[PDB]
Every structure is written in C-alpha cells, then in structure tokens.
C-alpha cells in the first residue's frame, strides 16, 4: 500500500565490511576499485510480509573526524546492525566493552542484530595462518551465538559481500525486527 519509512544504522569497528555490506545490498555489485568511507543518503525498497518498507540506510565510520559527528546519526533510529569481522577476533571482545554502552546511552530500547561478516575468510589459508601465528583462530559460530544471547541481540546471522551470501535475508530480518513497535513502556512514571 503506502510505503513505511524505517531508519537503519550500522555501527562497528573499521574494516569489518559495513560500508561494503550496505553497498552490495544497494546495487548488488561489488566495488572492486573504489569504496567510499561511508555510504549515506540512500533509501531501499523491501517487502517481507505483505508490507512495503523504505529502509533509510545510515553508515557510521570512525577513522578521522567522523567519531565526533557519529552521535547525531543515532536519533530517531529504528533498527541497528551491530557488525564485526569473523576473520578478525579482536572485533568481538570490543563489542560488549565499548560499542554496546554508546548504543544504549544514545538510543535505548532499540532492536539490535549482531552479525559477523565475510564467512569466506574464516576458511581462507592466509587468514588462518595469520591468526595461528598468534595462537588464535577465526571467530567460531558458537562464540557469536553465545554473544548474541549475552547482549540481548535480536538475531545473529553471517554475511559475505564478495559472494552476496545471506545479505537479503539479513536485512529482511532487520526490517522485520524494525517493524515491531517495542512493548509499551517499563516502570513508567505516574
């Protein structure tokens, strides 16, 4: 009928594929030469269950000077994709430490989907050898499942921008979660 506008924002450590994940979702064409630091001011049309939804995709980076302006993208946020890299274990442990409190502080009572990107690289020989150099291993799916339950994640999936694997379903669940209007209020004042 009449498309409903929902705001989606992606927050994560750098080089975990957030911009690429949105880009593959937008044009379904992997950019092999040029990747902007941020993908902004785009709205995508998606239908999940009899409803047509225009999803406005915001993107947050923190390489240089974007961290100062990051907070003002949080207001009026409908759904969040907290992203990290499967081929980089360092990303996982910082989510509970730093990413979560900022998200809760600026925009609480918002759905959150914890996702791990680039499932292909966990089996890659080069990445496996590099992690083994430090007696490390790629982020196991069990750890991601435990983390999702640990921090109240709405859902946990895995993406692969190079192979375009699971992107449609991931954002499909993202908007499905967004369409839920929370549950009233808790401990509301009189």
């Amino acid at each position: 009928m009449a498309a409903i506008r929902k705001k989606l924002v992606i927050v994560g450590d750098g080089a975990c594929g957030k911009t690429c994940l949105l880009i593959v979702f937008s044009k379904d064409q992997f950019p092999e030469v040029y990747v902007p630091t941020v993908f902004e001011n785009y709205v995508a049309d998606i239908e999940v269950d009899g409803k047509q939804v225009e999803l406005a995709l915001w993107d947050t980076a923190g390489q240089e000077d974007y961290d100062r302006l990051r907070p003002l993208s949080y207001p009026d946020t409908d759904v969040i994709l907290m992203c990290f890299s499967i081929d980089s274990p360092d990303s996982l442990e910082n989510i509970p430490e730093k990413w979560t409190p900022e998200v809760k502080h600026f925009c609480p009572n918002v759905p959150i989907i914890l996702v791990g990107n680039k499932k292909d690289l966990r089996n890659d020989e080069h990445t496996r050898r590099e992690l083994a150099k430090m007696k490390q291993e790629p982020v196991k799916p069990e750890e991601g499942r435990d983390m999702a339950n640990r921090i109240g994640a709405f859902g946990y999936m895995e993406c692969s921008a190079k192979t375009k694997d699971g992107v449609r379903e991931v954002f499909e669940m993202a908007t499905r979660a967004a369409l839920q209007a929370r549950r009233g209020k808790k401990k509301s004042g009189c």
Partner: protein, 583 residues
C-alpha cells in the same frame, strides 16, 4: 575556501564560480564533504543558494547542479540533510517550497531530489513542544500548508517520482491532518484551508478510487474530523461535516445529501458515520464534550446536524428517563434514612442500607464534582467494621454521609431544565467565591480568637471559642466579657471583629454576582446545554450494546449505487428546513 564559496553563492554571481569544477576534480573533493559543509548544522552550498534570491532568481543553482552531476555525488548533494536539532532533517526541497520558487521545485524534482524526506527538528514541532511552525514534515504537506496549489499539482503529477498523498510522518499524521493542524478560526484561513482540503481530497479520490484518505488514522488514532473537533478548529470541522460535491464520480465522498423537496420545504439527509453513540469507534460528539478542552466548545454545538441530534436523543431518553435516575437516589436516601431507626424486616432493610452505600461506591469506582460523591462512598465503608466492633463512633461517620446524600440531591436538580441554572450557580459560588472566602475567614477567626484570649488574660480558649460562636448566633450570653482583664479595648474590638467578618462576607455576594456570575450569566444557556449534553451521554454509556442499538437515531438510507454496485448505506439522520428565498 568554504567562506568564499558561501559568499559567491550569496551574491548569485555565476562567473565567480568559474574554475570550481577543475579545483574539485584536482583535489577529488565533493560538495557534500565536511569541509564545505558548515559544522554547526551541516549546511551545504545549495541551501545557502536557495535562501538568497534576487527577484526570485538565482543563477548559481544550475551550475551547482551541473558540477554535482559531473563529480558523481548528485544524490548525496541533493539529499544531504541538516543535523542540528533546531533544523534537523531539512533538505533543499523544503527551502525551495518555502521560498515559492515553482521552477526550482520542478528542477529539484527532476534532479532526483528525495520527495518523502522528513524534517523532524525541534523547530518544526507544534507550539506545545517548543517549535514554531508545524506542517507535517513532508514536502507535499508543506506545499499544501503554505497555500501553493501549483506545487501540489506538480508534486502529485510529476513523471519522475510522485508523492503519495497517503504518506504518514513519524506522528502518523497525513496531509489532511496537517491541514487541520495549521488551520485557525479566522475567515480567510478557513476559506483557503477548505479549498485546499477539497482539492486534495478530490485528487486522492481520482488517484486512489479504492481507498479513502479520511479513513486513514495517525498513531494516536484520530481522523481529520475527530482531530478538528478535539482541537477546536471550528471552520474546517463545520466544512467537513456539511461537505457537498456535485461531481458524480466523487459523490460518495460528500456527507449531506438532499432527498426531496416539495416547494419551500426541503429535507436533507446527513451522515452519522463516526458521529453517533453506541459505536465501537470513538464518537465525534463524545470527544467534543468529554476531553475537548476547547474555548470554542459552545460554538461547536451550533452546527446543524450536531444540535438537532441531541434533541432527537432528548425524545428517547432526555425527557422520559431522567425521572428514573432521579428516583433511584431518592429511594437510596430513604433506605439510608431508615438507619437511625417487624424486627426481621427492619434488620433486612438495615442490611439493604449498607448494600445501597456499597452499590453507590461500586458504580462510583466504575465511573472513575464526583469526588464529593466519592467522599460519600468512602465514608460508608468504616461503618461496617465499627458496627461489627460495637464501637460508638460509627454514628459520626453516618452523620457526615447522610448530610452528603441530601446535599447530593442538588446534583439531581441540576439535570432538570428548570433547576439547571440555579444548581450550577450554587455550585460555582460554593467553589469559586464561597470556598476562598470561607478559607480566609476561618484563619481570620482563629487569629481574632487568640486576640480575645489575650485580652481576657487551650481550655480557656475552647470556652471562649464556643461561646463566641453562640455570640454570633446571639443566643449565648457574654460570659467571656465578664472575665476580662481589659474589656474596654475588647468591647470595640468585638463589635469591630463581627463587622469585619460580616462585611467581608457581605462583599462576597456583591463579588459573586458580577465578578463570578458575570460570565456565568452570559454563558448559562450554553453551559446548560453542555450540562444537559453530558447527562444525556452518561445515560447512553450505561446501557449495553443491545439497549443502545434499540435506539440508534436516524434511519438507514441507501444514498446511491456505489462503485461496487451495492448501494452505500450510511446511517442517516434527516433534517427538515424550509426557506422561501431561492427556488
């Protein structure tokens, strides 16, 4: 540098922009980059260009658009929003519409500018929320609000990307809701708003035959008519209620039809959809007199189909069933009066007394000056516990409650037309003037009692106070005076104190008639209808759905064959009016 570009854009000189594209391509900079944008609000070059215009003409805009297309950031360039809370969400198209530049609006539309962009900054909220101007946060609604019909026509008829009229903002308001919001009671505003409303409704009808725009509701769950009734915008509500449209294709959208005429007498049907009691959806009449909080509420009842509906209701319940509700309280008063007083029958009636008080409390809790009635219900309770106990103080509680009941009789007088004004006047005096006067007088009396005690030179004060009340009556003798160290000063004071208490109370009567009753005298007739209306509504609310369905006013009429073919059957209430003028 950024200030130089801003100044160039401010002047409007296209020549000064020469060489900009080579600079940007050499530096690989974008017009949407942070450096070029103003840090305070994120403002870009194009908004600055739009805000400055020479006789409504700025030559930089096409060059800016051309270079933005050359660099390949046109989408980001035109969709870049402001991030300041004060001006959050504003885009170039909002400025273009606000500045009444048709050609620039068309250009921006042609260049892929977002047309459903929201502007939810604090400056765009209603007055209550601290904002200045509210229009619905959509370009289409913004054009509709500022009396720009050509822009609405273009936005809805453009080939590149049309703007759905059904679109809803964060609040859920549609264009019609915003139109109702910005309307006021001034004549010109109501006229322009009505014309815009009708044009919008007809356009939506043509574009969307199956749907009905007014049916759409906001997050709060208000239709445009209901919101117009609630907020007190009289003119648009009156126009929405008496909408008549000649066009055959859109005939079903209008409300007041005309069935037949026989000369100077005409009988026109009206539409009671969403305007009558015993309906699952909220009733416009009910919300108009329950949570209106509107200073023009009294004038909202003067509308043709509104006023008469109450008289038609009056026949069914008003004039025939007020007796029963009055009588119920009379019977309860008798049952209670039996308290002080066939031992078995008397005990049964005594149980009935507590049962009647409990029933009054049970219906009181369900209904929630009914706080006075609540006090009565509260007082009933303690008596049962103390009666089981055998304590001797339950009589005091019963005394308070009994007097409260006989006083409540006044509320029953208020309902009747004959006593409707007198009861309300007594209540108003008891609340506005009498209450404050008594409050002040009590403290004054206590202080003067202390003064009299000092002149006499707790129990010694209690005797004086009781005998002083007797002195006000005059039955009691002046026992205090005899036992006074300094009566000479007291004698003048005692008379003076009585004068002051009485004269201030005498002034209250003068104050009440003019200061308090001055506005009551003028609006008593309007208030009486409101009082009558509230009483009528409560009667219908009590009755269950079956009982309400028994007396749904009006007669079902098939107005005409609908698009489906099954005639539209609104529940219509005929109105008879004769007029010699015209034919």
């Amino acid at each position: 540098n950024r200030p130089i570009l801003f100044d160039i854009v401010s002047r409007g000189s296209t020549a000064d922009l020469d060489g900009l594209l080579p600079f940007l391509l050499t530096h690989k900079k974008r017009l949407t980059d942070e450096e070029f944008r103003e840090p305070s609000t994120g403002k870009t070059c194009l908004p600055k260009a739009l805000l400055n215009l020479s006789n409504g003409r700025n030559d930089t805009i096409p060059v800016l658009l051309d270079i933005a297309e050359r660099t390949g950031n046109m989408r980001e360039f035109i969709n870049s929003p402001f991030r300041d809370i004060y001006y959050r969400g504003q885009t170039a198209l909002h400025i273009a519409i606000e500045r009444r530049c048709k050609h620039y609006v068309e250009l921006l539309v042609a260049q892929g500018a977002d047309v459903h962009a929201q502007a939810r900054g604090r400056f765009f909220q209603p007055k209550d929320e601290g904002g200045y101007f509210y229009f619905g946060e959509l370009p289409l609604s913004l054009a509709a609000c500022t009396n720009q019909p050509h822009i609405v026509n273009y936005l809805t008829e453009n080939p590149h990307k049309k703007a759905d009229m059904r679109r809803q903002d964060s609040r859920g308001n549609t264009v019609l809701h915003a139109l109702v919001a910005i309307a006021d009671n001034t004549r010109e505003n109501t006229k322009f708003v009505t014309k815009m409303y009708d044009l919008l409704l007809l356009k939506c009808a043509r574009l969307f035959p199956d749907s009905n725009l007014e049916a759409v509701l906001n997050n709060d769950g208000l239709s445009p008519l209901m919101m117009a009734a609630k907020t007190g915008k009289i003119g648009i509500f009156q126009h929405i209620i008496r909408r008549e449209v000649t066009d055959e294709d859109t005939r079903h959208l209008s409300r007041k039809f005309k069935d037949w005429a026989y000369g100077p007498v005409y009988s026109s049907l009206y539409d009671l959809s969403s305007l009558d009691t015993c309906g699952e959806e909220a009733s416009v009449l009910e919300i108009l007199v329950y949570n209106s909080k509107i200073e023009n509420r009294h004038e909202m009842l003067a509308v043709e189909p509104i006023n008469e509906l109450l008289r038609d209701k009056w026949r069914k319940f008003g004039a025939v069933s007020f007796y029963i509700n009055v009588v119920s309280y009379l019977c309860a008063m008798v049952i209670f009066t039996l308290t002080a007083y066939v031992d078995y029958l008397r005990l049964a009636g005594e149980v009935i007394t507590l049962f009647t008080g409990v029933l009054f409390f049970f219906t009181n809790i369900k209904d929630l000056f009914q706080l006075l009635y609540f006090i009565y219900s509260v007082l009933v309770i303690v008596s049962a516990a103390l009666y089981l106990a055998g304590i001797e103080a339950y009589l005091a509680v019963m005394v308070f409650a009994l007097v409260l009941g006989w006083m409540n009789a006044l509320y029953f007088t208020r309902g009747l037309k004959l006593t409707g004004t007198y009861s309300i006047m007594i209540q108003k005096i008891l609340f506005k003037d009498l209450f404050r006067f008594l409050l002040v007088y009590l403290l004054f009396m206590i202080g003067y009692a202390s003064a009299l005690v000092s002149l006499l030179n707790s129990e010694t004060f209690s005797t004086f106070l009781l005998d002083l009340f007797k002195l006000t009556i005059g039955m009691g003798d002046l026992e205090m005076l005899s036992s006074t160290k300094y009566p000479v000063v007291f004698i003048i004071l005692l008379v003076t104190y009585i004068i002051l208490t009485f004269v201030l109370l005498l002034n209250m009567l003068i104050a009440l008639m003019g200061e308090t009753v001055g506005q009551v005298s003028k609006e008593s007739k309007h208030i009486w209808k409101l009082q009558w209306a509230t009483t009528i509504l409560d009667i219908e609310r009590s009755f269950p759905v079956f009982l309400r369905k028994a007396f749904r006013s009006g007669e079902m009429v098939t107005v005409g064959k609908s698009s489906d073919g099954t005639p539209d059957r609104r529940w219509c209430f005929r109105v008879d009016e004769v007029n010699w003028s015209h034919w």
